[PDB]
Design a protein around this ligand. Sequence first.
Ligand code: CL
Lengths: 181, 183
Amino acid sequence: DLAEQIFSATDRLMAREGLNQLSMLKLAKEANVAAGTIYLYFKNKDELLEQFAHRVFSMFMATLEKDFDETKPFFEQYRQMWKNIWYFLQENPTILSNLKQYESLPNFKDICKNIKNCRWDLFCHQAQKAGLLAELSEDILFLLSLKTAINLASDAKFIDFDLKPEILESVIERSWRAIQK
Amino acid sequence: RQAKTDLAEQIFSATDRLMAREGLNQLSMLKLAKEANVAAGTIYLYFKNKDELLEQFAHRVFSMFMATLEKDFDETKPFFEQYRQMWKNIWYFLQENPTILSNLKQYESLPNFKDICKNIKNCRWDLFCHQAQKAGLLAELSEDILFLLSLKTAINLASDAKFILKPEILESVIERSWRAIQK
Ligand SMILES: [Cl-]
């Protein structure tokens, strides 16, 4: 509500000026609220940025869950998560531009590590258990595979893949190919 | 006679450091001269202002990347080994130069990491793709897509090594990222 307004303002301000240039006064300006109002919702910049990081990971998990179907073949589960990332990034240009900056958020590593049993980690376990995937760690598998969606995400490549979906399917299958046992 | 290139590199080296420790936004010429151990006069003579500095720095950054791809290149080896060399070149370069690794993200804000990049005459990657495609080895996908499916892993692994390792694992990634771009 007012919190998402402020988080959304954090993205924009983080995209337009650096993460280093954020202040509670500036964020209040950018969210079109008085300086007092922002402090009603967060005690300080650290807390705001902590909760912001948590909102970012919450979106990431949302994206991995959308139209999840465990009855489908593992490839089609993978294809679905790849497309969810793709289309999420198409729809959210400020988030796309800010992806690299999020790694500098103070709470980012500490939040990232403490997520047990997320949708990707479970997919890798099931898929390894069925004999499909390489016995490599889940991080390395991600980097060889779903990460290609983040790697490729740009405006010119949204246009190209929508015109030639053959290319998008090729990239999905090839990125899957990389993590086959 | 170019002690002028060496002095430029003295300043560029310092640009990296001040960019890695403080932000790119917080750069100013006074701060970069102190870091480089050059007089205020020297840096202002070399570069018209902060803009012209960061332009030339960009070009210098593209050059180091191109030189990294070229190191130990050998047409006579198989295309996989050429690719494996390039992977290792990137991996060990970024591990040896972590200050460069930090600034990778912030580099795209430089004028012009768009313009100066697309405009690269005879890039080793491009050339390699052409020879390997001509031989029949690689997917018929554009050179950037092929990169983003393959060598890109070297950069992503170095970068996320910090936020998340044995030699068999590195070879697995080299071989598997290669696998993604095979015809
Ligand atoms: Cl900054």
